[PDB]
Amino acid sequence: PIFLNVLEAIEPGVVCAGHDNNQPDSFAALLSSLNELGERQLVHVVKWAKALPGFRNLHVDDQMAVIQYSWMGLMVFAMGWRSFTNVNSRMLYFAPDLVFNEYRMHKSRMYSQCVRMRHLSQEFGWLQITPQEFLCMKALLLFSIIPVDGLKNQKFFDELRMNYIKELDRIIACKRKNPTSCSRRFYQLTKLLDSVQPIARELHQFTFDLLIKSHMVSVDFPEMMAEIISVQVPKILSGKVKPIYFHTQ
Numbered sequence: 001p002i003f004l005n006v007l008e009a010i011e012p013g014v015v016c017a018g019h020d021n022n023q024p025d026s027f028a029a030l031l032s033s034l035n036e037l038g039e040r041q042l043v044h045v046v047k048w049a050k051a052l053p054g055f056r057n058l059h060v061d062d063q064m065a066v067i068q069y070s071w072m073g074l075m076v077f078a079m080g081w082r083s084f085t086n087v088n089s090r091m092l093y094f095a096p097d098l099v100f101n102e103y104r105m106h107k108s109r110m111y112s113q114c115v116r117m118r119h120l121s122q123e124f125g126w127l128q129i130t131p132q133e134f135l136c137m138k139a140l141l142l143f144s145i146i147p148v149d150g151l152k153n154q155k156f157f158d159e160l161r162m163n164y165i166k167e168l169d170r171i172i173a174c175k176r177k178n179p180t181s182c183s184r185r186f187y188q189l190t191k192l193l194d195s196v197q198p199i200a201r202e203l204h205q206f207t208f209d210l211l212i213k214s215h216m217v218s219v220d221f222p223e224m225m226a227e228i229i230s231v232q233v234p235k236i237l238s239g240k241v242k243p244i245y246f247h248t249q
């Protein structure tokens with residue numbers, strides 16, 4: 001079980017936000033803490049990505065790009081898992097010290113986005129996603145969004161993507177002696193992965209708008225954070241960079 005060995009070995013651990021839970025909730029405090037958390041999550045995703053099997057076959061610039069474009073979706077995906085495993089998807093488990101009840105969902109002004117994120121979280125339970133299915137799915141999320149004009153070396157990317165699809169296909173939980181079982185299972189997981197992208201887009205839009213008006217609402221954006229949001233995210237929001245869907249929408 002070599003592939004799965006790697007994924008579990010490299011799976012990040014706990015990442016705290018730094019948030020002061022003894023102060024009364026407020027938009028600026030909430031979003032500042034999420035942004036700091038995004039910065040911290042980003043560092044970890046970078047190290048995780050680079051330790052992935054076959055990832056360094058990618059050209060150097062494609063590596064950072066692929067990381068930057070997928071960063072939100074990957075965060076959202078793993079955050080839903082934490083929420084699923086730690087609170088049965090009742091609240092959003094961004095970090096041990098940053099857990100969103102309904103009131104923070106409202107005070108963050110992200111209620112519509114949070115609702116979608118919680119739905120994804122509930123899907124892990126509804127589908128009974130195994131932890132092994134989660135790891136391969138998350139690995140695959142990293143290779144699910146590219147420039148329409150293509151990467152610097154697309155061949156190596158397509159090869160990686162193909163192989164991560166195959167690894168996901170090997171490990172799906174199904175009665176192998178029944179073809180219909182595994183077909184259905186695969187369909188569902190492909191559908192679930194597809195459902196991360198619209199959510200990532202809504203978040204992309206929110207953070208982008210938030211960044212533009214940050215100097216009025218008093219929200220802090222960390223350095224790597226703001227680089228990504230001002231340079232990479234608009235390529236997504238403008239159609240230059242699109243998600244690879246399994247199923248046509």
Ligand SMILES: Cc1c(N2CC[C@H](O)[C@@H]2C)ccc(C#N)c1Cl
Pocket residue numbers: 031034035037038041075076079094095203207210
């Ligand atoms: C959506 C999101 C984060 N967003 C929410 C909006 C904010 O601009 C920030 C980038 C931050 C951290 C995690 C985690 N973990 C997640 Cl899932």
